[PDB]
């Protein structure tokens, strides 16, 4: 509700007035120095900061600045002073316009006590034209207390939804996280969907993101869909929420294609083959006119700006960043007094940096594609200084940090096509500008005393047309059947990455069945599972993991890996087709071992 509000602080109580703020329309406007970023609560709902002018001393809660009224030189204003422990009083004066060093500002020569800082300044019209900007005491001397406010904004903020529901229409939402968000926009469109009685699907990249949607949509009739279920259908006003990989593995497994006519994919830039595949299908369903869909992303496929916009200002520092352990030179890493996010190209690389900064006495959390859904909640819960992470953190991973150290690198999987066909982990090579923009994205979403900093190294590379994922999604995609007998294609811009012809990867009969199984139960990469299945090898049959050249022998910690089979024999792990991803990290390999023995 609109008006004037006192700002009380306690814990342990405590209870003293720090300043005054103004709620107008639906947004709260007070001084920066009063809250300094701290959250607020009242009779209904908490308040999150989104806009703040650091030096200019003013902050906005629940969207950008809203106060649209200006003072004019030589006039008459009214400071509605809300003294701490005292009743509101209007104070009128003739406000002087004095010289600063930037230019010229208007102010009032009035003195009120600390904890009044942020009282409204009212014009003859009645609309608030500024805030009581302490201070005070400017040279020279006495006062003066500045008439402090920003320029009209614009946009910022705040709704309402365009009719993006009309079938055969696809929308990209260049959502800015920090303004709100899956907090404000997603329930808003979901609500509107139910009113239009549309078969709705929400697609969230990780599980823990979907879990964050679940609560952001508490009350709403929404059912999470376990991937261990081929299809679920209740036949009532219900919104399915699932992981991207759930959607595609369902489209693969079950023949019961539910005819959603609305599909909202959050973080639609995920280049995981499952996600690419999903985007492929959903796109074709839009084309059918059988569906309309929304793709939420800060960096839509195609986008190449490594420095997009943010709701909070980011400093972009370019430096040298270590790849192994360090000693001297790189003190700025350690010297920093705040929470940091660090992107490493691989899990192995991760372990160095951690071990190295662990010596400095820094509480570091490690993140990888597997450990993520088990390690990310710890970044909220426990106290820490450094989260080292792989590029998994590009998918809606929200951290409360101030710095991202991003050596701008990664490993990309590649299929070499000379003699034997195999997948290797190329690099570390430079990331995509999109992926850079995304890593940087983690930072600079909360207004902060110091602007958040993106500390990077090197220029990204656009071309990833040899990435396995694209051709891996093609084989994923064109093994999903449709009731209209149409072959699904890669989604628009993403098409130009695959040089393959449409459908060529199609697997007939119950080879197709194996290909699904290998991915779903045996838990193998798409390329691998494809080559094994299309060889007519049954899912139980494992004796292919032992027929390779000298070259194909898998290694673990510099030693030949030798496994104990189901029928019981020690055999050197030597796949026919070599896919690097199965041994790229211990847990992957550990898991592949279990498969190869027959215990899966």
């Amino acid at each position: 509700s609109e008006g004037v509000y006192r700002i009380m602080q306690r814990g342990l109580f405590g209870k003293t007035q720090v300043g005054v703020g103004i709620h107008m329309e639906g947004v709260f406007h007070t001084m920066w120095h009063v809250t300094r970023g701290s959250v607020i609560c009242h009779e209904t709902g908490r308040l999150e900061p989104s806009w703040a002018d650091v030096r200019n001393d003013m902050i906005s809660y629940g969207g950008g600045w809203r106060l649209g009224d200006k003072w004019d030189k030589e006039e008459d204003v009214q400071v509605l002073a809300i003294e701490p422990g005292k009743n509101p009083k209007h104070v009128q004066t003739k406000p002087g316009l004095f010289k600063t060093l930037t230019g010229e500002i208007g102010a009032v020569t009035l003195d009120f006590k600390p904890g009044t800082s942020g009282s409204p300044i009212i014009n003859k019209k009645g609309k608030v034209i500024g805030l009581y900007g302490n201070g005070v005491v400017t040279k020279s001397g006495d006062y003066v207390s500045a008439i402090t406010q920003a320029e009209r904004i614009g946009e910022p903020d705040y709704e309402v939804d365009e009719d993006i529901f009309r079938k055969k229409r696809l929308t990209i939402m260049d959502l800015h996280p920090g303004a709100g968000k899956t907090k404000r926009i997603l329930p808003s469109i979901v609500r509107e969907a139910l009113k239009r009685r549309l078969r709705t699907l929400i697609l969230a990249p990780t599980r823990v993101v979907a879990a964050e949607m679940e609560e952001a949509l508490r009350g709403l009739p929404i059912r999470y869909q376990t991937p261990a279920v081929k299809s679920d259908h209740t036949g009532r006003e219900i919104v399915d929420l699932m992981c991207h990989a759930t959607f595609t593995t369902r489209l693969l497994s079950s023949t019961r294609v539910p005819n959603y006519n609305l599909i909202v994919m959050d973080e639609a830039h995920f280049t995981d083959p499952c996600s690419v595949a999903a985007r492929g299908y959903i796109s074709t369903r839009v084309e059918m006119g059988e569906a309309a869909a929304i793709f939420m992303t800060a960096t839509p496929p195609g986008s190449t700006d490594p420095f997009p916009q943010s709701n909070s200002p980011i400093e972009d520092i370019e430096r040298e960043i270590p790849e192994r352990s360090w000693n001297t030179g790189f003190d700025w890493i350690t010297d920093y007094q705040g929470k940091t996010v660090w992107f490493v190209p691989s899990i192995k690389a991760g372990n160095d940096i951690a071990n190295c900064l662990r010596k400095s006495g820094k509480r570091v959390i490690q993140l990888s594609r597997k450990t993520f859904d088990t390690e990310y909640p710890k970044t909220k819960l426990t106290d820490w200084d450094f989260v080292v992470t792989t590029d998994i953190s590009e998918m809606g991973a929200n951290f409360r940090a101030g710095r991202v150290i991003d050596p701008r690198r990664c490993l990309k999987p590649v299929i070499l096509t000379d003699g034997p066909e195999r997948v290797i982990l190329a690099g570390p090579i430079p990331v995509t500008p999109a992926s850079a923009a995304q890593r940087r994205g983690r930072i600079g979403r909360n207004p902060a005393q110091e602007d958040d900093q993106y500390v990077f190294s090197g220029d990204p590379l656009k071309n990833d047309e040899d990435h396995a994922h694209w051709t891996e999604a093609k084989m994923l995609l064109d093994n999903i059947y449709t009731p209209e007998g149409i072959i699904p294609t890669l989604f628009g811009p993403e098409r130009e990455k695959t040089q393959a012809i449409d459908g060529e990867f199609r697997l007939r009969g119950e080879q197709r069945k194996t290909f699904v199984e290998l991915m779903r139960r045996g838990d193998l990469p798409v390329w691998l599972s494809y080559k094994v299945a299309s060889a007519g090898i049954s899912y139980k049959d494992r004796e292919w993991c032992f027929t390779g050249e000298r070259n194909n022998q898998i290694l673990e910690e510099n030693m030949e890996v030798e496994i104990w089979t189901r029928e019981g024999e020690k055999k050197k792990l030597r796949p026919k087709w070599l896919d690097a991803r199965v041994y790229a990290d211990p847990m992957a390999l550990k898991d592949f071992k279990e498969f190869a023995s027959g215990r899966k």
Binding site: S1, Y5, Q9, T35, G126
Partner: peptide
């Protein structure tokens, strides 16, 4: 949280 609100006033010019 540790900060709170208390509605003390409404915005209007004194005629």
């Amino acid at each position: 949280a540790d900060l709170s609100l208390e509605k003390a006033a409404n915005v209007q010019w004194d005629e």
